[PDB]
Enzyme design. Structure first.
Site, mmCIF file in Angstrom:
data_model
loop_
_atom_site.group_PDB
_atom_site.id
_atom_site.type_symbol
_atom_site.label_atom_id
_atom_site.label_comp_id
_atom_site.label_asym_id
_atom_site.label_seq_id
_atom_site.Cartn_x
_atom_site.Cartn_y
_atom_site.Cartn_z
ATOM 1 N N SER A 30 93.761 -31.818 20.335
ATOM 2 C CA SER A 30 94.228 -32.989 19.260
ATOM 3 C C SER A 30 94.679 -32.522 17.786
ATOM 4 O O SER A 30 95.592 -32.904 17.490
ATOM 5 C CB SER A 30 93.335 -34.281 19.248
ATOM 6 N N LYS A 75 82.936 -24.407 22.076
ATOM 7 C CA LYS A 75 83.934 -24.521 23.104
ATOM 8 C C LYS A 75 84.695 -23.400 23.685
ATOM 9 O O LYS A 75 85.690 -23.227 24.052
ATOM 10 C CB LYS A 75 84.782 -25.476 22.203
ATOM 11 N N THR A 106 89.691 -32.088 18.849
ATOM 12 C CA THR A 106 89.455 -30.566 19.224
ATOM 13 C C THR A 106 90.568 -29.883 18.654
ATOM 14 O O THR A 106 91.817 -30.165 18.720
ATOM 15 C CB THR A 106 89.453 -30.381 20.808
ATOM 16 N N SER A 107 90.259 -28.587 17.865
ATOM 17 C CA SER A 107 91.170 -27.630 17.531
ATOM 18 C C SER A 107 90.648 -26.362 17.992
ATOM 19 O O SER A 107 89.557 -25.944 17.659
ATOM 20 C CB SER A 107 91.182 -27.882 15.743
#
Ligand SMILES: *[C@@H](CS(C)(=O)=O)[C@H](Cc1ccc(CN)cc1)NC(=O)CNC(=O)[C@H](CC(C)C)NC(=O)[C@H](Cc1ccccc1)N=[N+]=[N-]
Ligand SMILES: [Cl-]
Lengths: 196, 250, 231, 243, 241, 125, 244, 222, 204
Positions: free
Chosen positions: A129, A33, A1-2
């Protein structure tokens, strides 16, 4: 995930990828998200999907009830509710949340809430991450009081790199613009951002 | 603070009467007339829709309520007391039966559970009895069609046909003359409308009358197809138009 | 009349009769006096006996090294409230390493008595208390009533015939307030004050009870041959 | 009848007599007032000097909630303290969850609901106090007055106690003569006058004046007591007006 | 006669405490009205501020329960606020548990069931209020649902509450006899507010200034109250016709 | 829970509920105990207004608490069952912890203690 | 507070009686008469329905007679709703005993526990007692055929023949006259019906106003059968004894 | 297990295989994995079979009670919210992985739910041990603006991919179509491509083959 | 220390033309030690038959529990419980102990008295229903029973023929499992008669 949130002249912009993984398999390649806890208070979720989802629902409930009694809540108030859940249930949660919102008095604000449940107010924030790969890039390229178009490019370029290097990140880049004008949703596809 | 009323508010008087139950029955007597008739191939339950104001939408207030797909209920007495009983009755049908046996309870047992709830309001601490009498019609595979009455005491009795509330004494006499053991469902609906016209005073049409049946299965009302064993609810509420059609050939 | 069955009921004129009846129990109790200077605070109490074969009911209770009270009315209720004060004084010491302010002591007694006057089943406390103490803002004297009302004073008295001592102290105010650095003279003024509430009986050796607290003096009680000096 | 023996019982009028009886206890108590001003609020109260033996300045009646709200009351003093203790718990849990200090209208409803709850059951007694309170928040100044029933409204000026009618009349003049607004320092001086004028209804025992205030400019939005030179200045202003 | 102090039956099958709670309803001496347009639902209520020392902006009997639901109360303010806070909490919990906005009629039923419990359980008294809920429901359209201390509730084409309720009721009845329809056949909500004020003026026989009224409007996806100047603009439009 | 203080003092220093319980005993059928040099005998009355009774199955008036102790009574029959049950349980509990059956004095002291507890407990007669 | 409104259901009168128990017994005396007769080779239970209406469904009805297990039944007199609360408790208690010991519950043990519940409502809790009297008819291998009764006081006793409800005084005199110890079931059936036929407040005793049940060893070899009589079976037994 | 959900023009379709297993052993060759929450809301379940069935029945019961209380047809988001809050409370110890699909007054909806309480939205989804085989077919052939007959074909093709290529999945294909404005049609055994061939020999024994020690008539009657 | 295989045992059920059959072994052991050769695992509540394999304490406990529940059912409903309904009761009761379960493998068998249709069903320890036209298996030799049933079974077998098929399925499966055997019992169930036969099998 960014995920990232960035303050600018006219307000604040939230950004995220769309990849959800169960190990190395991509369970969902078009995930959203970026989630609404109030009209102009949104959050970016990283960590356990179940935990962030459950937390965001409880916060949306608390702020809906706040608005019924006391009127529109501040972005600081929303961050405090997130914190209270994350801190008091730290032993049973894996949630990294960025809270972003627009007041008319306070303009754009960004609060980040890591694993412990601590709160940190910042000009911009990055998490997930894939954020590890862009600390260097974001620090060098961030400026205060940017324009809307400048801030969109900053997020697009940043998440583009986070996606490129992080296997847990990918898909489309979703963004959400929060200003006095209202709420705008943006999307950017691989064919555009990959060749930046 | 806290509920300090941990004692009974319904007690025996020197004459052996339970005052609050008798007074609850008096409240039922004041209430609007409702009735039920059992046929060979179905059951009908009916009542008048007493409107509080002409500005009020009487469609929104439902006196005849579905409890299960094959069981319906109607009342006479205090409407709020009935509304909460329907909520509790619908819930107990699931918790104490459907969640255990995977099927809906038969009429007699659901009636039994409603009766239990009403009896406890007669004995438990800091509460008054329910101010209603219910008529519960229903069907189940092993007992067939049936019709029951439930009083504020918690007592229940099965009926071939009966009436409760305002003009129940005259209505019961009318039903004794017309009822036989060979009645078809359409014949029972016809008699139900005739009996109810006697007790109603003002307008008598589909908009002022509320009527429902427990009859054949309705596959069209099920909402889905594909499972042969599931054939649809036997409970059907008659429309405003469907009542007026039968009032012309009256 | 019809509005005195319990404490939860107000009268038509806005009175709480059960509270007023509890206030009556204090008037039946034996006299006790309180007074202070800037350096010391003194309690003087007339003890009462059942008969000549009995002992004299102890009126003064110690709450901490720097604080204590005298009672008038139901003694068991004074035991309950003094025990609560001992705990609160102690909580302040263990948790905050802080001697409990005499003003906060009063505020805590007020709030404890109040809850008994607003709930069904319970009853008001049937006792009045005079709390003396020396803290960070000098000497203090408080008067507690079971209605909840707590009041800080230079001097006062409660119990039967307390109006005699209360008048004397109201005249002597300017004299005894300036008895600084002299314990024996401040007690003498308190013993002379309680004497204005005596009828037929006089102050004997096993009848009088005196307590003192001050700048370089812990809360200590004097009985028996130790009070013979002041008769 | 018997409808006034138990709390939470409706009389045939539709009234709760026990609450109305609690109002009588409030009317019996000492006078207290509240004045809303340009950028804040002022509170004042009458303290009856029962005896020479009372220590001056050392029987404080005005109470603070959080750091920005002042509360004053007339009637049963212990009941008022109980209400403030709850107010302090309510304000603490708000700040704990929502970070920001509790807004005044939000705080007003927290006391309102609590007082109203004490009219719902016979196992509890209604509150024997009318409570004047307020402060400064993000939306500016707010003054409120709460009654035994749970009823409260916002006020330009508020008064309760034995001299409430005298004080109300004097308050109504200030609203008429100052439509654009009254300053904070003026409101302290006026408050002193209105307590001295309202003392005429309680003139057997002489009294001690006590004033407090919240102002965006003068006290920086926090609740403080008026003491020393500013107190004596307000006393002298009040003394000059009675003569 | 302790059967008149608590909620237990009397010899003639009546709950006197419930009946006396109905009488507490009119203690404020305020009249309310509610009507439905094509796209909207309007509610109006009298506003009386007797004391000069009161801050008139804080005096209100209309409440914003949720974004879509509004509620006007007839009764004392403490019980009014008690009911409002609970309704706000119930609406919020409904959204959280079931994933969609609580409908007007469902909230009415829930508050009515709570009122029913106070008529059966002894330790709890009834609230002396009549709650009128309004919204534009996404399934049923413009909606008016009203609750009382007995626990009764029903939907309405239009409705009125207060001391002079019956005069307002018959005024509205006669209009719907004439128009032959269930609602106010009007496009904008502004003219539906004008209709509401006009028919209240005719029924009560009094004229209104800007500070004598209090107006709440429900449209699709929001309920809002009007300011003094919004009402003044509306009063000017009636006068010039 | 039901809390009401049913057994309370009166102005003359009597607990009426306890005294009215004695009247219920006075109503009950007669019972007598006589102890000899090497035995004890318990005699009991049975009212003769009841014919068509089944004496095989009807509850007997004298009850065994243990193999060595018996209990007869006068008063409310339903009430006596509750005391007998509690006594029987305490008899077996004493054997379990002390490894010895109860003395007659101890068993009496227990039953009497139960009776006393119901004179100053809330909610009970 | 709430003291004001408390009836105090569990107190003594000055005479040493329990007010509520006495008044509950007054209630039960207006209920339809129920009779139990015990024979050497079985037990009969007979009961009179409360003023029947012609439109009452008779065949699918249960008011007076209820089954507790395969070996035990009860006849009710009082509030039916109250009885059903106690019946479900008794049905459960019987199944607990069977689950624990793998044996059918002895009749007296079930009766004692149900009676102990009723006792509790007269001594504590501040609630009204159950307005019910039972006649228990059952069989076990210790005492064989047994008849008991319990009332709102929680007191229970055993019987050869007994009546509860209305006109018990008159009914008990007639049973005391014609009953003898060597009696058969078929004779006891006749006695039960003859007693009701004379003590009834109705004009004539008919099939539609009666519930009837037997507990015989009339099954095949050393086992007990419960027979709850159908409408047509009551009609035939009423003709066979010459009442109609 | 292989399960899919596919959205189309005027509604949504779900499908599943019919194999039930205990380890490598096939317990049921023709179980029905398509459960009913409400008349027009259907649920397809994978993971622990007792859990998916237990959780689906509980929420379906509470949905029915809610529908009766509100006098409204139940919404898919209500089932979703109730399921996910139940599962989250048990921290994944209830091993239910579901595809929830249905039509309601709001429109047509398609969601997935995981044992820990997370949810997803999508036009096409797949869960179970054969999800990767199915998702490969869905990613190859899915497009925007599918017809009813196209969506059924795509869904059953995705289930077939699981049947043939995944060992956990097999036997037949069940389908349930939920179109807006119409009744939902459950198509039990829509395809039966795995019929058992005729056996080479009959194993009917001569009568008397089995040795017996004792015979006795059992009493089932009273 | 695996609860499901301490005591040992097996159960199998089949359908036929207007009939059903259910069969079980008789062994109860403590791992390798054989203790009892009389431990029947099939019980009945009216006309509905239940077989239970697994931990023997739970087998006994559940029998006592279902006897309790079906007795109360019959008293309240005034009729005997049917197989379809009883199946749902078992599932409910097992799932009620989701996080502390009975270590059992139950099997329902019977004929619906109204419709006359033959019915069988199986469950895991935690309550999941396994319905089947043909056959259900359970126990320590479940693998073996699955193989025997899948090959030997055909539809619409007459009662006398169905007896041979189910008996041969059980016997030959039991002989390949160390913890199963030591005797066997077969119930043949027609609409209104039930025959119980004890089989002769090898005692090792
Ligand atoms: C496929 C799921 S998968 C292989 O993970 O992709 C199917 C889905 C399914 C089948 C049947 C229905 C009908 N209700 C619904 C969904 N699931 C399975 O094959 C899973 N099978 C099971 O869970 C077994 C079912 C029995 C009826 C055979 N049970 C077991 O495997 C238990 C599970 C268990 C054991 C202990 C503690 C918790 C769970 N194993 N055992 N003993
Ligand atoms: Cl509800």
């Amino acid at each position: 995930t960014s995920i990232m949130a960035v303050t600018f002249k006219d307000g604040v912009i939230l950004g995220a990828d769309s990849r959800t993984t169960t190990g190395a398999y991509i369970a969902n390649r078009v995930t959203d998200k970026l989630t609404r806890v109030h009209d102009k208070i949104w959050c970016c979720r990283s960590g356990s999907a179940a935990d962030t989802q459950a937390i965001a629902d409880i916060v949306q409930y608390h702020l809906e009830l706040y608005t019924s009694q006391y009127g529109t809540p501040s972005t600081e108030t929303a961050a405090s509710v997130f914190k209270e859940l994350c801190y008091e249930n730290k032993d049973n949660l894996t949630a990294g949340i960025i809270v972003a919102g627009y007041d008319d008095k306070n303009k754009g604000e960004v609060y980040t809430i890591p694993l412990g449940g601590s709160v940190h107010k910042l000009p911009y924030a990055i998490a997930g991450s894939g954020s590890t790969f862009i600390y260097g890039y974001c620090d060098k390229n961030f400026r205060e009081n940017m324009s809307k178009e400048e801030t969109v490019d900053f997020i697009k370029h940043s998440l583009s790199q986070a996606i490129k290097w992080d296997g847990s990140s990918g898909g489309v880049i979703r963004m959400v613009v929060l200003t006095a004008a209202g709420v705008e949703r943006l999307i950017f596809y691989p064919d555009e951002y990959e060749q930046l | 603070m806290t509920d300090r009323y941990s004692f009974s508010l319904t007690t025996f008087s020197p004459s052996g009467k339970l005052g609050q139950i008798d007074y609850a029955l008096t409240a039922v007597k004041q209430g609007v007339t409702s009735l039920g008739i059992k046929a060979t191939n179905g059951v009908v339950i009916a009542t008048e829709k007493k409107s509080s104001s002409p500005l009020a939408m009487s469609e929104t207030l439902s006196k005849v309520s579905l409890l299960t797909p094959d069981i319906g209920a109607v009342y006479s007495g205090m409407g709020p007391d009935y509304r909460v009983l329907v909520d509790k009755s619908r819930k107990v049908a699931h918790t104490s039966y459907k969640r255990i046996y995977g099927e809906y309870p038969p009429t007699k047992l659901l009636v039994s559970e409603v009766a239990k709830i009403m009896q406890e309001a007669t004995q438990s601490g800091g509460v008054r009895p329910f101010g209603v009498s219910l008529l519960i019609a229903g069907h189940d595979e092993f007992n067939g069609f049936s019709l029951y009455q439930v009083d504020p005491s918690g007592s229940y009795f099965p009926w071939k046909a009966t009436a409760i509330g305002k003009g129940s004494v005259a209505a019961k006499t009318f039903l004794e003359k017309r009822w036989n053991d060979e009645l078809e469902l359409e014949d029972a609906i016809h008699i139900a409308l005739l009996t109810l016209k006697e007790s109603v005073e003002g307008e008598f049409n589909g908009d002022t009358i509320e009527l429902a049946i427990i009859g054949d299965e309705n596959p069209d009302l099920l909402g889905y197809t594909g499972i042969p064993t599931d054939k649809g609810p036997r409970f059907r509420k008659l429309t405003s138009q469907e009542i007026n059609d039968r009032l012309e050939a009256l | 009349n019809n509005y005195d069955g319990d404490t939860v009921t107000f009268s038509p004129t806005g009175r709480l009769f059960q509270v007023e009846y509890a206030l009556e129990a204090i008037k039946q109790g034996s006299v006790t006096v309180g007074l202070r200077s800037n350096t010391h605070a003194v309690l003087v109490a007339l003890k009462r006996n059942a008969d000549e074969l009995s002992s004299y009911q102890k009126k003064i209770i110690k709450c901490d090294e720097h604080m204590g009270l005298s009672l008038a009315g139901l003694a068991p209720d004074a035991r309950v409230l003094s025990n609560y004060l001992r705990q609160q004084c102690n909580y302040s010491s263990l948790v905050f390493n802080r001697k409990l302010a005499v003003e906060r002591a009063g505020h805590l007694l007020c709030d404890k008595a109040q809850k008994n006057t607003q709930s069904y089943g319970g009853r008001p406390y049937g006792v009045g208390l005079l709390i003396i103490g020396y803290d960070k803002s000098g000497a203090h004297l408080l008067e507690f009533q079971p209605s909840g009302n707590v009041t800080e004073l230079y001097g006062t008295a409660i119990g039967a015939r307390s109006q005699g001592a209360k008048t004397y102290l109201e005249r002597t105010l300017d004299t005894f307030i300036k008895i600084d650095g002299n314990p024996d003279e401040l007690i003498k003024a308190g013993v002379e004050a309680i004497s204005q509430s005596l009828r037929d009986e006089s102050l004997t050796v096993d009848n009088l009870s005196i307590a003192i607290v001050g700048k370089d003096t812990p809360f200590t009680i004097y009985d028996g041959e130790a009070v013979a000096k002041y008769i | 009848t018997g409808y006034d023996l138990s709390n939470s019982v409706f009389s045939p009028d539709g009234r709760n007599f026990q609450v109305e009886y609690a109002v009588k206890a409030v009317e019996n108590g000492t006078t207290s007032i509240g004045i809303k001003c340009n950028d804040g609020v002022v509170f004042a109260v009458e303290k009856l000097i029962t005896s020479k033996l009372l220590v001056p300045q050392k029987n404080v009646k005005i109470q603070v909630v959080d750091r920005h709200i002042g509360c004053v009351y007339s009637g049963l003093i212990p009941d008022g303290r109980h209400l403030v203790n709850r107010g302090r718990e309510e304000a603490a849990s708000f700040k704990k969850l929502y970070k920001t200090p509790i807004p005044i209208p939000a705080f007003a409803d927290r006391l309102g609901q609590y007082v109203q709850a004490h009219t719902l059951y016979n196992s509890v007694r209604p509150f024997g106090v009318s409570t004047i309170f307020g402060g400064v928040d993000k939306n500016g100044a707010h003054l409120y007055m709460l009654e035994p029933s749970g009823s409260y409204w916002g006020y330009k000026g508020a008064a309760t106690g034995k001299g409430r009618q005298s004080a109300k009349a004097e308050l109504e003049k200030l609203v008429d003569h100052h439509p654009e607004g009254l300053s904070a320092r003026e409101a302290v001086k006026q408050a002193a006058k209105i307590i001295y004028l309202a003392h005429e209804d309680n003139k057997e025992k002489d009294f001690e004046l006590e004033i407090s205030w919240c102002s965006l400019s003068e006290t920086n939005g926090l609740h403080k007591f008026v003491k020393g030179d500013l107190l004596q200045e307000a006393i002298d202003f009040a003394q000059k007006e009675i003569n | 006669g302790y059967d008149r102090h608590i909620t237990i039956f009397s010899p003639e099958g009546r709950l006197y405490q419930v009946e006396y709670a109905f009488k507490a309803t009119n203690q404020t001496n305020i009249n309310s009205l509610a009507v439905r347009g094509k796209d909207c639902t309007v509610v109006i209520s009298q506003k009386k501020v007797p004391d000069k020392l009161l801050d008139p902006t804080t005096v209100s009997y209309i409440f914003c329960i949720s974004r879509t639901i509004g509620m006007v109360v007839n009764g004392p303010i403490p019980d009014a606020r008690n009911a409002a806070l609970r309704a706000k909490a119930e609406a919020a919990e409904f959204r959280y548990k079931y994933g969609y906005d609580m409908p007007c009629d469902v909230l009415a039923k829930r508050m009515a069931n709570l009122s029913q419990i106070y008529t059966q359980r002894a330790y709890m008294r009834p609230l002396g209020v009549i709650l009128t809920f309004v919204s534009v429901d996404e399934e049923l359209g413009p909606s008016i649902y009203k609750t009382d201390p007995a626990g009764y509730y029903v939907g309405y084409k239009a409705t009125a509450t207060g001391p002079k309720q019956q005069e307002i009721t018959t005024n509205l009845e006669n209009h719907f006899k004439k128009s032959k329809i269930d609602h106010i056949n009007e496009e904008s909500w502004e003219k539906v507010v004008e209709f509401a004020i006009t028919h209240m003026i005719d029924a009560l026989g009094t004229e209104f200034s800007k500070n004598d009224l209090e107006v709440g409007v429900a449209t699709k996806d929001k309920f809002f109250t009007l300011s003094a100047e919004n009402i003044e603009e509306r009063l000017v439009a009636i006068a010039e016709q | 829970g039901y809390d009401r203080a049913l057994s309370i003092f009166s102005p003359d220093g009597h607990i009426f509920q306890v005294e009215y319980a004695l009247e219920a005993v006075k109503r009950g059928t007669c019972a007598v105990g006589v102890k000899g040099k090497n035995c004890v005998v318990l005699g009991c009355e049975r009212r003769s207004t009841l014919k068509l009774q089944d004496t095989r199955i009807t509850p007997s008036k004298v009850s065994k608490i243990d193999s060595h102790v018996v209990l007869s009574f006068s008063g409310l029959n339903a009430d006596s069952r509750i005391l007998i049950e509690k006594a029987r349980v305490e008899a077996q509990s004493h054997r379990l912890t002390l490894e010895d059956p109860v003395t007659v004095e101890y068993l009496t002291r227990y039953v009497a203690g139960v009776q006393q507890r119901y004179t100053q407990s809330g909610g009970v007669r | 507070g709430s003291r004001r409104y408390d009836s105090r259901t569990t107190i003594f009168s000055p005479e040493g009686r329990l007010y509520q128990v006495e008044y509950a017994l007054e209630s039960i005396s207006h209920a339809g008469t129920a009779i139990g007769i015990m024979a050497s080779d079985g037990i009969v239970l007979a009961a009179e329905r409360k003023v029947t209406s012609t439109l009452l469904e008779q065949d699918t009805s249960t008011e007076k007679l209820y089954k507790l297990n395969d070996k035990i039944a009860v006849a009710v007199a009082g509030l039916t709703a109250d009885a059903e609360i106690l019946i479900n408790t008794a049905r459960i208690h019987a199944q607990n005993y069977l689950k624990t010991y793998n044996e059918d519950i002895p009749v007296e043990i079930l009766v004692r526990r149900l009676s102990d519940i009723k006792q509790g409502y007269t001594q504590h809790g501040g609630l009204r007692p159950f307005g019910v009297s039972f006649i228990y008819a059952g069989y076990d291998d210790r005492y064989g055929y047994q008849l008991y009764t319990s009332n709102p006081s929680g007191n229970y006793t055993g019987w050869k023949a007994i009546s509860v409800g209305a006109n018990t005084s008159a009914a008990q005199t007639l049973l005391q006259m014609d009953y003898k110890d060597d009696m058969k079931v078929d004779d006891a059936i006749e006695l039960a019906l003859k007693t009701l036929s004379k003590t009834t407040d109705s004009s004539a005793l008919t099939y539609d106003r009666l519930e009837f049940a037997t507990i015989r060893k009339g099954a095949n070899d050393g086992e007990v059968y419960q027979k709850i009589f159908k409408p047509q079976e009551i009609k035939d037994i009423l003709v066979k004894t010459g009442i109609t | 297990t292989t399960i899919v959900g596919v959205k189309f023009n005027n509604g949504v379709v779900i499908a599943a295989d019919t194999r039930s297993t205990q380890g490598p052993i096939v317990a049921d060759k023709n179980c029905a994995k398509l459960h009913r929450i409400s008349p027009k809301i259907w649920c397809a379940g994978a993971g622990t079979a007792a859990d998916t069935e237990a959780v689906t029945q509980l929420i379906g019961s509470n949905i029915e009670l809610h529908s009766l209380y509100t006098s409204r047809e139940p919404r898919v988001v209500s089932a979703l919210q109730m399921l996910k809050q139940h599962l989250f409370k048990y921290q994944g110890h209830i091993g239910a992985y579901l595809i929830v699909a249905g039509v309601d007054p709001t429109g047509s909806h398609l969601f997935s739910i995981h044992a820990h309480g997370s949810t997803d939205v999508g036009y096409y989804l797949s869960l179970g041990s054969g999800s990767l085989a199915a998702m490969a077919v869905l990613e190859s052939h899915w497009k925007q603006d599918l017809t009813k007959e196209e969506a059924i074909k795509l869904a059953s093709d995705a289930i077939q991919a699981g049947i043939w290529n995944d060992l956990g999945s097999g036997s037949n294909v069940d389908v349930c179509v939920m179109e807006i404005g119409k009744d939902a049609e459950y198509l039990r055994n829509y395809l039966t491509p795995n019929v058992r061939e005729e056996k080479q020999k009959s194993y009917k024994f001569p009568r008397g083959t089995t040795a017996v020690l004792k015979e006795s008539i059992v009493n089932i009657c009273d | 220390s695996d609860p499901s295989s301490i005591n040992g045992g097996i159960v199998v059920a089949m359908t036929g033309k207007d009939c059903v059959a259910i069969a079980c072994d008789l062994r109860l052991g403590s791992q390798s030690l054989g203790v009892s050769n009389k431990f029947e695992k099939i019980f009945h509540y009216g006309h509905v038959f239940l077989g239970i394999t697994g931990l023997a304490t739970d087998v006994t406990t559940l029998n006592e529990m279902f006897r309790y529940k079906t007795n109360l059912y019959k008293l309240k409903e005034e009729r005997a419980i049917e197989p379809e309904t009883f199946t749902q009761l078992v599932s409910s009761s097992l799932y009620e102990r989701r996080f502390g379960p009975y270590f059992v493998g139950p099997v329902v068998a019977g004929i619906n008295s109204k419709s006359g249709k033959p019915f069988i069903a199986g469950f895991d320890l935690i309550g999941c229903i396994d319905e089947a036209k043909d056959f259900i298996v359970s126990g320590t030799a479940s693998d073996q029973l699955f193989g025997m049933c899948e090959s030997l079974y055909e539809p619409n077998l007459e009662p006398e023929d169905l007896f041979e098929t189910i008996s041969q399925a059980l016997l030959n499966a039991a002989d390949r499992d160390a913890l199963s055997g030591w005797g066997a019992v077969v119930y043949i169930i027609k609409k209104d008669e039930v025959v119980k036969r004890y089989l002769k099998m090898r005692q090792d």
